[PDB]
């Protein structure tokens, strides 16, 4: 349900 993303977002 939560947002994830590429690690460069921090």
């Amino acid at each position: 349900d939560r947002a994830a993303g590429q690690p460069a977002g921090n």
Partner: antibody
Framework: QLQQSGPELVKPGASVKISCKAS????????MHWVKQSHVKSLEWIGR????????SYNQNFKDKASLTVDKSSTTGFMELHSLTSEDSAVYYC??????????????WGAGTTVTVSS | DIVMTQTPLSLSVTIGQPASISCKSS???????????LNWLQQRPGQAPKILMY???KLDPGIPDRFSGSGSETDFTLKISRVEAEDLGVYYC?????????FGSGTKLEIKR
Amino acid sequence: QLQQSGPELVKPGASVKISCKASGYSFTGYYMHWVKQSHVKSLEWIGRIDPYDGATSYNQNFKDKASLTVDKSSTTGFMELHSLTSEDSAVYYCAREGHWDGDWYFDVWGAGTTVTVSS
Amino acid sequence: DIVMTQTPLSLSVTIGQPASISCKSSQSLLHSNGKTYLNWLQQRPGQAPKILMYLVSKLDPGIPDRFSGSGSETDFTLKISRVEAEDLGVYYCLQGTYYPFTFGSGTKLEIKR
């Protein structure tokens, strides 16, 4: 799927707030990012925001220059730029970090907002 | 900040001919989880950037299969098997492994006819 606000003329030292309206997907489930384009050969990541709880992550270059917020009721993201200088004249994009095949990438982009800093 | 270098600066390719673009990162983009977060973007004039490929080699579902990607952990290549008219624009690599995100210099592709 992402609609940005219109072009802005800003006096140097003033501030501006631009918006990114989302539609057609679960707003709180995906990060909203902002990107600065000073010209055709420059792209810079400004920061991201989690619309679920408003948590933000910023590029160190844009801390104290930018601040990201969301309004969940209208499914809109906002970026406010503070105390602008001529180096802040650029085109500003919002993007959704989408999900496909279990992997994450910027799959939807706004059309861009032109900000011109001038007296 | 990771420095992303693209070569060539500009490229001129005839319709139906192959095209090749390279990207170099100042550090290895292999992350602890085993994923190499390297993206290729295309920006047509007057339009927003568009992700073509992510994770070095994976195409976005709406991108034609004439695009392909290869690379190691620091050196990457975007290939167009047969260039078409809609492929003009500026191509950027974007690294997503190390904070913050950093884009490449950009490579201009002109279509020869």
